[PDB]
Structure 1
């Protein structure tokens, strides 16, 4: 019968630095060869210190994000303060658990500044399970990302590989390099690439062109 869940494409890669955070998601929204819209940024910024990506079924992406935006003003106008990073993480896990029967189909990665002003990454799943991590890679193109990411970033699958903290500009070129290798295989990654960088000063965005097919 009618399928309530469908994969609309897109790949979200968010790597949060020490004092900063970087969330990169392709703007291509497509199913199959045809491209719905060439510019469709998947990164939605709830606040200045929080930027969450939305992947998978697009109907649940607009619903879940706009609900949080409606719930942002709730806690705002109540305690006269912004929502903590751990608040939105658990509130989403509770909403998705109450929906465990029929849930939303979404793939999200939260990143930005926490209450201490540092970056964090939470891997989200339709059942609402998450943990605090340094970096994660979602989307359908993540199959070739994490092996290549742990290579450069995690420094695995190699011998005598030292761990160097990634500078703000180092994480930019690495995300671009792992996405170029991803666009050459996955057809859902391409067109314009939206890279959102979360800094203590503000939110920074960038647009990177890719293949059209």
Structure 2
């Protein structure tokens, strides 16, 4: 975690659908912006999305490592990787480099697939501390402006249309409060039958 290359991710869990949002700021220096199309969320599987947050030299590196390991595990099993085995994999990949850590604060949003479907949201830290959360979860630079923010705008179980508005207002009200992040927003709400890549016209300040 560093102020260099700021940004943050957040994942919300509705009734049967889950949503993950992030900003799109590639901060060159701490107080600088050179790109507004830096998606911090990656399609790791058909129903297992990951969101990395932190330094950009480790976000792109950890994504290439996870894609090298997930594809090596999906074709070896001839079935897609679930979330429970993928979530514990990140807890070992991050711990395998405990001396030279990867400055990333990931998040994992994806259906557990018990025909059935479960939310299964979790986050980590710089070293790989697993944190299972059946409700909303957030990690990034704006972690301080999002824990208390989502605590007042969160319902127990919401539908698909209600989860997107509950997560868009949760991110737009916190990205405008932070200075080193928030040059855009790209919420990826997904249901067990379809995904939605909805962008937001956030405050370009």
Does TM, scored on the shorter chain, surpass 0.5? yes
Change (3 A) 1:175 1:187: same
Tell me the residue number matched to 2:72: 74
1:169 aligns with 2:161: yes
SS for the counterpart of 2:94 is helix
Which residue of 2 is the match for residue 158 of structure 1? none
Alpha-carbon offset, residue 26 of structure 1: 0.7
Classify the secondary structure of the residue corresponding to 1:36.
coil
SS at match of 2:119: coil
Paired residues for 1:165-204 under 5 Å: 165-204=157-196
Question: In the aligned structure 2, how far is the partner of 1:181 from the partner of 1:72?
Answer: 35
Closer, same or farther: CA 164–71 of 1 in aligned 2, 3 Å: closer
Tell me if the contact between 1:22 and 1:112 (Cα under 8 Å) persists in the aligned partners: no
**Offset from partner CA, 1:20-59 (integer Å, 9 cap, x none):** 1100001122243321201111110111101111110111
Q: Does residue 28 of structure 2 align to residue 21 of structure 1? A: no
Q: Distance in 1 between matches of 2:93 and 2:156?
A: 38
Distance 1:17 1:196 in 2: 13
> Cα RMSD (Å) of the superposition?
1.7
Paired residues for 1:86-125 under 5 Å: 86-116=84-114, 117-125=117-125
- Size of the aligned set, in residue pairs, is 200
Q: When the two structures are superposed, what TM-score results if normalisation uses the length of structure 2?
A: 0.90
- Are 1:127 and 2:127 counterparts? yes
TM-score, normalisation: structure 1? 0.86
Q: Does 1:210 align with 2:168?
A: no
* Structure-2 change in CA distance of 1:73 and 1:28 (3 Å): same
Rate the CA distance shift 1:73–1:181 in 2: closer, same or farther, 3 A. closer
The gaps in structure 2 that reach 5 residues or longer are: none
Shift of 1:204: 1.5
2:17–2:159 Cα contact (<8 Å) kept = no
* Matches for 1:145-160 after TM superposition, within 5 Å: 145-153=146-154
- Alignment CA distance shift 1:96-1:22 (3 Å): same
Structure 1: 5+ residue runs without aligned partners?
154-162
CA distance in 2: counterparts of 1:94 and 1:32, whole angstroms: 30
